[PDB]
Design a protein around this nucleic acid. Structure first.
Lengths: 151, 116, 65, 65
RNA sequence: GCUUGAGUCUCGUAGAGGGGGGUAGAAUUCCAGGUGUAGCGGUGAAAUGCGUAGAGAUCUGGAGGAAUACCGGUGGCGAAGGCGGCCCCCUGGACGAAGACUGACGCUCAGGUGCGAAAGCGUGGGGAGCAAACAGGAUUAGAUACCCUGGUAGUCCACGCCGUAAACGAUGUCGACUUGGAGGUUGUGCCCUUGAGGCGUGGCUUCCGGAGCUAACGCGUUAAGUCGACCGCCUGGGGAGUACGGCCGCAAGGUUAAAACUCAAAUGAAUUGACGGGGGCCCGCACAAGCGGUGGAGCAUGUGGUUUAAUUCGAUGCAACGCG
């Protein structure tokens, strides 16, 4: 990336109700290239959380990650010497990315019965501000907010 | 309390701390705060932000004096000396003037030879 | 870059702070000839004129007051 | 070193500060006596000043274009 | 005899030139009090340290010591060391204008004499800051170093003494001559101050550069150019500016100054590289954002070692080890 300032790569939407965001969620959950089982897992998890919550899948995803999407994150921009944690506010696509990836690692952990139930219950906890992914969000937010002395 | 009208605000801004103190016409202290006491023990207290936090925390404890307008007066170099002015302004004190008494020897004592 | 000493016969005096208060700054401290013209000879003569003024309290050493 | 800065200010406006002395003397007198480096640094910077004057004299070039 | 060298005089100028004596203000520290509080300080981070006996902060008063912010300028003065607040006293030199006077009164100098930064030494004061030694903290593998907190001699004053420095433009002093450019500073003559001026000429002076010189870098009217006079000094590197002896010194040590022995080099300037915990620009899955692995287990295989009679031979840092 020395000279490249390259942009983005095309991603096809949901084969169900079209959502680039849910497709990116599928691609963050996919392992070994198994896109079919990835999208199947996410489909069942969102439809189960949808029958639970009484909101459509899109709105459930929306205000269930909106409680995990971060604001500022920590970087190490060493200047005039030693390296210290400068908090950069995260761009919106980085928000989407970090949120989905924390939810997915949270679901990788927290093993109850099957990945579908894990992920579904997990973003329910993230909708009600209770899960390990939202705990990750708040712990990044207090990993920063204690280094504001650098701006 | 004592309903003091107006005052001066000394910012002893060093290379390590930034001592904010509030005093009056007669030169008597009403309260103070410092970037080392406001947290920021160490590498952060020599930053401009901790200085403004000290200025905010010293705007605290002088609300009880009804101090209306402040004569900010600074001293010495450092990361502070400007962010403390910003914070003493944004705290709602009518900054009536921004002077300093930063001391300059007329070639007096020999200074320490430090820092090889 | 005007040296008033170009037409100023009755060379620099320590009582004419009316004329001296232009060769100092807000603080009371002498100004450089590289910025105010003032041929070096008269800059030195007015330097000691300002010093004698300060001694007679016709000018402040600093603006501490 | 002191300014009223009438409250219709909204400004720093303390260009008097970093234009007159504050840091020009303080951060270089804070330590370091050494009695001899003033002349060394003096003539390094003074060679650079005469070099600026040489630049101003011989600043006639072709821009490579 | 002579005036072109060298001086004397009359008028002034510029100056941190010198010695003596007063004095001012800022600032650091200390002392006493006022207000005020849990921090100050310091560092890369700390900790020693200081602080609830109430500090740091801010204010007033008092004491004392050292150096003089800005002016500040390759600016000035001085033989060199060196000298910078202001004022007074005694004092040296420089230099310009014009005129007069003496009439070679000159230049250079072994030995001799004198001045000679800083450290250091003796006697007596002084002691604010800084600070060898010293002590503590920290760093570190160790750290009797850098760093931090303290801190004694000392730095300060008078009077002696030492007599050395990279005391260095590493350039002995004096005189003559030989193209230039821009400056700085200090004199002075002329013309229109005609209105911040223009034309000459004296002194000191900084930088570029010509002929020349030089091994080259460079010097270049302030020569390292062309010469003249006198002085000092050198003769391969190490041993050695050492030893012995002399002279000086209170002491530290200084000055003069070898020999054996050993090496065939030591050295200068410049050139091409390579390298830098030097500078500028730039690139690579180099790092950063991310995914998946190795290192753990079992097995396959190659390797080292051991074994054996033989466990053929070869690759054996990246760039050998599922390699021939």
């Amino acid at each position: 990336p020395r000279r490249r300032v390259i942009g983005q790569r095309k991603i096809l939407p949901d084969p169900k109700f079209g959502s680039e965001l849910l497709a990116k969620f599928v691609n963050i959950l996919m392992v070994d290239g198994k896109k079919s089982t990835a999208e199947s897992i996410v489909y069942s998890a969102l439809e189960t959380l949808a029958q639970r919550s009484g909101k459509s899948e899109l709105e459930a995803f929306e205000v269930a990650l909106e409680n995990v999407r971060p604001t500022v994150e920590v970087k190490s921009r060493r200047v005039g010497g030693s390296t210290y944690q400068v908090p950069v506010e995260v761009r919106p696509v980085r928000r989407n990315a970090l949120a989905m990836r924390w939810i997915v690692e949270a679901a990788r952990k927290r093993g109850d019965k099957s990945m579908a139930l894990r992920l579904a219950n997990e973003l329910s906890d993230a909708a009600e501000n209770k899960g390990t992914a939202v705990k990750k969000r708040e712990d990044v937010h207090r990993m920063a907010e204690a280094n504001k002395a650098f701006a | 309390r004592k309903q003091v009208s107006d005052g001066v605000a000394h910012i002893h801004a060093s290379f390590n701390n930034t001592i904010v103190t509030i005093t009056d016409r007669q030169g008597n202290a009403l309260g103070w705060a410092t970037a080392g006491g406001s947290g920021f023990r160490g590498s952060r207290k020599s930053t401009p932000f901790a200085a403004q936090v000290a200025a905010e925390r010293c705007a605290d404890a002088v609300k009880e004096y009804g101090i209306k307008n402040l004569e900010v007066m600074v001293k010495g170099p450092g990361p502070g000396r400007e962010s403390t002015i910003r914070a003493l302004n944004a705290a709602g004190f009518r900054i009536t003037n921004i002077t300093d008494v930063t001391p300059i020897p007329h070639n007096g004592c020999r200074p320490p030879k430090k820092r090889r | 870059f005007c040296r008033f000493t170009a037409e100023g016969v009755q060379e620099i005096d320590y009582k004419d702070i009316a004329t001296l208060k232009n060769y100092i700054t807000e603080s009371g401290k002498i100004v450089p000839s590289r910025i105010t013209g003032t041929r070096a000879k008269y800059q030195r003569q007015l330097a000691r004129a300002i010093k004698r003024a300060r001694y007679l309290s016709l000018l402040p050493y600093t603006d501490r007051h | 070193i002191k300014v009223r800065e009438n409250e219709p200010f909204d400004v720093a406006l303390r260009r008097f500060k970093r234009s007159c002395e504050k840091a020009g003397v303080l951060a270089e007198v804070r330590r370091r006596e050494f009695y001899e480096k003033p002349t060394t640094e003096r003539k390094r910077a003074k060679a650079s000043a005469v070099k600026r004057h040489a630049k101003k004299l011989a600043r006639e070039n072709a821009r490579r274009t």
